[PDB]
Design a protein around this ligand. Structure first.
Ligand code: CA
Ligand code: ZN
Lengths: 400, 160, 48, 80, 80
DNA sequence: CACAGTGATGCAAATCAAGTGTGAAGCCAGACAAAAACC
DNA sequence: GGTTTTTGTCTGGCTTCACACTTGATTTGCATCACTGTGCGCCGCAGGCCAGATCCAGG
DNA sequence: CCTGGATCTGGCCTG
DNA sequence: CCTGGATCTGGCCTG
DNA sequence: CGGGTTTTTGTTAAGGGCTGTATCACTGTGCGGCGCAGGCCAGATCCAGG
């Protein structure tokens, strides 16, 4: 931008663009920590000071050599500052929604915001040279997005805002960035616990905020759904992924889910896992190990993030597509008639399926399943291309 | 750079005194050099040598930061004058026009080449007696002839 | 969040200082500004 | 570039940047295959066509099923 | 004229892009032999080019310096 | 001795608001009058 | 030498634009810092959980 | 009761 | 001479 | 109230050129590990023929 601006000004004479520092001094309206606000119950254990933006994410961890060693770098917003900067950003859209829903503009009703949380670890980032800690080569990004805003009028609630692209890259707002392992528990809790503190604080308050000359009041509902299965197992205090206890919504075993397979009901929640960890830790009936694990249904840790039980959609796509890929590779070998097979027969079935998928569906083969592969794979054209390689026809109609 | 890196890693374990060691002892010397080089010279440990690692590694302060790990004083003098010779010889094949950027280092490249050669043959007899890597031969043998022929080598490089 | 991860590598290579004590701040600031909707009503103001 | 040009022309009213069909038409002045040139003597096994740009670097390598399987894509400029 | 910053990325002008492997010798020779034929022809002639109102005359000298040791040993025909 | 970024910071240099009253200059008027590049 | 073009002039008087300075008060430009990447390959891995085959020592 | 070759085999050089 | 709990072990679940 | 009357603004269609937007099969972010591939060569290392 600097050399574009420099060339445009040095050629055309007049200054069409703006210099860099003007953009700098006009970007501070959009970063957090610019606008005034207050909470009508003042929030527990967070200051009412309203000009804090990019603060350190460690929250003053003891970095001495005499302590538990830390090696991560973390920068974060304050959670209330990020929420108010996002709402003052969406100000104009809120006003237009109140116009278009045949409401007024000057309302100050209790606007209920519904926001969505997401945390996911990244790999293969590279630490640099130079001074600093011995930082790992991963990253954890905690971010949120504002899914919808309703207001109460009369006795019904009308939607003055509803996000059009809920899975876009333009609506998820970053909140905390750190360089630590997803599976390393201690530094993960060390960075993320201030955020949970601010959230459980502001889950019971009324933010008063001036929106175009009028103060208005917002309440909040946080929905944690942007978590993959592995992170829900890790931070909800449940067991690992391959246990007998599979579902993070209901209490059933893996063999029971293959006998009934449909009829369940959602039973797991956050308060239930907290009380079950208390049951496990106290051992109040004096059972053995295995009877206790039956009693607590697999909870063996303290859950420290409240979440909503739900299903991640993208990884459901990828997991079901890989399972169907294994079914296709197991049907061209007729394993229902050859129940024993070598390694190399299975390898050759895989290579045959790869060649025929490239010949028919124009798909190159990959070892890590993607989403575009998952959408191109779950067609009927792919089951025609696979049914070209089965000798039977009962398997044809079953796959169809 | 990779050859000097192996020379450092091999000189830490005093291979001139102990001609045999297991591969775990080589691994221990690698971890020693790597964590001390992140500690005192700000270089993270890398798998493949790239150009910036070669630019930061071939400094006299890297020898000053590695001679703490190796005990003997004669080994300190050998490593120090080795790196001094190599840094006398590097701006002749790196300069884009070495006859008009460093003629004083160019006009006596032959003496520094022979001094580097006899210090490889004598003080490092345990590694370069009967074998030598190709780029050491190219560096010590040819480049006055090439710089007479063309005029530069770093101009005709391949970094572009 | 995964599309945000796509943005993150781009912002880490293209829009940050290359120092270990500054990169998280610059990346967090840019990824905040990119998702800012006040800077997005401008680019589709030709649709008015 | 289309986004930048479109919103700058939408805001300022003026047309500061050129639309990208004008960029495409001003691009071909510098791509290969524009100027007249004469070799002296003519080059062996080289045509004297002066409008040859991006050509398939296979140079007509036979891709039939009967002979050697080629599996590369190539694009090149003619050298002169 | 002298290239002032010779190892720039602004002056390594591209000529041919292929999706081959330099380990493979057959496809490498097959793609690359037209350019060597053109270069071998151009080593022994003159170019006439109209440069600012005046026809002027050029002749070339090609230097293949930018190959690593593996490719020189693999192309010039020496051992590995 | 690779070289073009990567953005915040901070120091220097350039511009400018302002008084009111000057200078400098372009240009209107129609007409009168020499250089000059072709036959 | 003709013929048309191409520049020149006039003085009275009109608007139009620059400047005389200074002291903040900005705005704008450019260095400076310690680093990046492109320099090579390969495949299933890691982490964890659990039924089942080994096993190995005491009755 | 070798023993003289076939044949591995791990180290080293370049990417 | 059993033989029944220790101790691998390879396969399957998520990324 | 409205004919007159002067201009404003539009349509008619045959061509032209500039600018705007739809269309096409595809991308990437969804996961981790490691020294390794290729090639060459001296040093063990085995194998049957007496
Ligand atoms: Ca992830
Ligand atoms: Zn379930």
């Amino acid at each position: 931008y600097h050399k574009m601006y420099r060339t445009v000004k040095a050629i055309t004479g007049r200054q069409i663009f703006q210099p860099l520092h003007a953009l700098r001094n006009a970007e501070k309206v959009l970063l957090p920590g610019y606008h005034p606000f207050e909470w009508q119950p003042p929030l527990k254990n967070v200051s009412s000071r309203t000009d804090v933006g990019i603060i350190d994410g460690l929250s003053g961890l003891a970095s001495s050599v005499d302590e538990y060693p830390v090696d991560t770098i973390a920068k974060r917003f304050r959670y209330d500052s990020a929420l108010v900067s996002a709402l003052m950003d969406m100000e104009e859209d809120i006003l237009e929604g109140m116009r278009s829903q045949d409401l007024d503009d000057y309302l100050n009703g209790p606007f209920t915001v519904v926001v969505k949380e997401s945390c996911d670890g990244m790999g293969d980032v590279s630490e640099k040279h130079g001074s600093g800690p011995a930082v790992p080569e991963k990253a954890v990004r905690f971010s949120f997005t504002v899914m919808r805003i309703t207001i109460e009028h009369g006795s019904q609630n009308v939607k003055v805002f509803e996000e059009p692209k809920p899975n876009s890259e333009l609506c998820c707002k970053p909140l905390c960035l750190m360089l630590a392992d997803e599976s390393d528990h201690e530094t993960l809790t060390a960075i993320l616990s201030p955020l949970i503190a601010e959230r459980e604080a502001m889950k019971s308050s009324e933010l008063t905020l001036e929106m175009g000359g009028i103060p208005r009041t917002f309440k909040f509902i946080f929905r944690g759904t942007g978590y993959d299965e592995k992170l829900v197992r890790e931070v909800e205090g449940l067991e690992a992924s391959g246990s007998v206890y599979i579902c993070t919504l209901c209490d059933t075993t893996r063999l029971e889910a293959s006998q009934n397979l449909v009829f369940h009901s959602i039973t797991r929640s956050h308060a239930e896992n907290l009380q079950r960890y208390e049951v496990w830790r106290s051992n109040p009936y004096h059972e053995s190990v295995e009877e206790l694990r039956d009693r607590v249904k697999g909870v063996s840790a303290k859950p420290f993030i409240e979440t909503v039980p739900s299903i991640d959609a993208l990884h459901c796509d990828i997991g079901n597509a890989a399972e169907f890929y294994k079914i296709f590779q197991l049907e061209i070998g007729e394993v229902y008639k050859h129940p024993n097979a070598s390694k190399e027969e299975r390898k050759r079935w895989q290579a045959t399926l790869d060649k025929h998928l490239r010949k028919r569906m124009n798909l190159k083969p990959i070892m890590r399943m993607n989403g575009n592969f998952a959408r191109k794979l779950m067609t009927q054209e792919t089951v025609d291309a696979v049914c070209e390689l089965i000798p039977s026809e009962e398997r044809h109609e079953a796959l169809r | 750079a990779a050859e000097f890196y192996k020379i450092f890693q091999l000189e830490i374990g005093e291979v001139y005194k102990h001609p045999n060691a297991s591969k775990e002892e080589r691994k221990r010397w690698q971890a020693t050099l790597d964590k001390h080089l992140r500690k005192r010279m700000n270089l993270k440990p890398i798998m493949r040598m790239n150009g910036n690692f070669a630019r930061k590694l071939m400094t006299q302060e890297t020898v000053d930061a590695v001679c703490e790990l190796i005990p003997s004083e004669e080994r300190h003098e050998a490593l120090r004058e080795l790196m001094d010779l190599y840094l006398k010889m590097k701006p002749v094949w790196r300069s884009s026009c070495p006859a008009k950027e460093c003629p004083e280092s160019l006009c006596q490249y032959s003496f520094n080449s022979q001094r580097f050669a006899e210090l490889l043959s004598t003080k490092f007899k345990y590694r370069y007696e009967g074998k030598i890597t190709n780029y050491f031969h190219k560096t010590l043998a040819h480049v006055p002839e090439i710089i007479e022929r063309d005029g530069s080598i770093g101009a005709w490089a391949s970094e572009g | 969040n995964q599309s945000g991860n796509k943005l993150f590598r781009r912002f880490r290579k293209m829009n940050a200082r290359q120092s270990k004590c500054y990169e998280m701040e610059d990346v967090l600031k840019h990824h905040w500004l990119y998702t800012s909707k006040y800077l997005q009503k401008f680019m589709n103001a030709h649709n008015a």
